Subunit: 85 residues, 6 copies
């Protein structure tokens, strides 16, 4: 199960990124994470082919609304790398 | 789920103004606010896509007079 | 229904001064404070529109001597729950 | 909608960073018979020390607290409110 | 003091930190303790294991995170003192 | 007044604060109270002990943290007043 991540400057661009990821491919929204400085990350789960398509589409949609700081697809993520606590 | 209206501002007072103007302009329901730090605050609204579009346009106009609107968006069919 | 008074400052001390001056200037009730990060603090008051306008004008005047007032606003007819800064 | 005055003065010191605020609070407590209410943080590194007590003691505490914090950090603002209204300290 | 080494990578942004933690885990036998966020976008990934494995994991994690975002600082503490990793 | 000195090192970033706390513990017989984070990357490491041990620990901790990151401020309070270290509540 690949992990898809999109980090934006501001929440509204992140909500748009998460919505566009869910509409583009069969991915599951894990949730959002905020680390301060306006940085918010949307995290998705699914097959590597679906995650790559979802992230590519999510970045394109978020760039029209706000600023995308970074994006990433981790094909084989290690245990608990998505659990930030 | 019905349409989702979002207005993000730099400062809380501009966000409260945006939420008040969104409610006064159309038949929308205020879901609440979301704050992500660094002064960023988002007002969220629910309703028919036509009402949400009118509410966000009027909320952005009112918040721009008071403070800085960072971004705004209407998502017609949110996946939630 | 009653009016909502808001004063946002950069720094807490200027906001506490604004809230104290609002309470001394008019028969308004201090709802509380809200902080959104980046030093942005908002003092919120409720009361009759005339009292709220006088309280905010005085709160802004007093806070400007101590620190920086970013923005101020009086909403005469605020909609329900617009002062509750939470997800719900 | 009727705020009353509280029986004791309130002193405030806002510094850029926590260590300068802890120094300010310690110097306020050592300079006069004041009670530390606590600390409040509003972001951007702005930390506030709040004390209560007689106006004379509060003034002496805030003046001394500002002097001590300025040696190890930056004091952004300070203020003494002699007859503070009830709930202005509840943040 | 303690037997297992501590590996730390601090980045500006969460995605670069997740990449650093993933690369650390893939490069050597290091267990991911977790993440720590102190505001201003600063996120830290923490690992533990043998000093040789931790040095290889941090070097690889920094290299991978630099391609994605900004690495603010990195460190391997060979003999960390007790409770140094517990942020209260 | 507390029966022991308070040592404080505030850094910009957690990693330089962890380094400062580790160097403080290695330099003298001090006890790490814990960390306090106030946002904007500001992290403070707090230590307890005799004033001589605390002064040595803070000087060493500042030197080690300056190699890794940015030290915003440092302080040793020889006779700290009650509850000045309690940031929460």
């Amino acid at each position: 199960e690949a992990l898809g991540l999109i980090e934006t400057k501001g929440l509204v661009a992140c909500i748009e990124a998460a919505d566009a990821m869910c509409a583009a491919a069969n991915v599951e929204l894990i949730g959002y994470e905020n680390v301060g400085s306006g940085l918010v990350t949307a995290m998705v789960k699914g097959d590597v082919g679906a995650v790559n398509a979802a992230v590519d589409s999510g970045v394109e949609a978020a760039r029209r609304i706000g600023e995308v700081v970074t994006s990433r697809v981790i094909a084989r993520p290690h245990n608990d790398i998505e659990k930030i606590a």
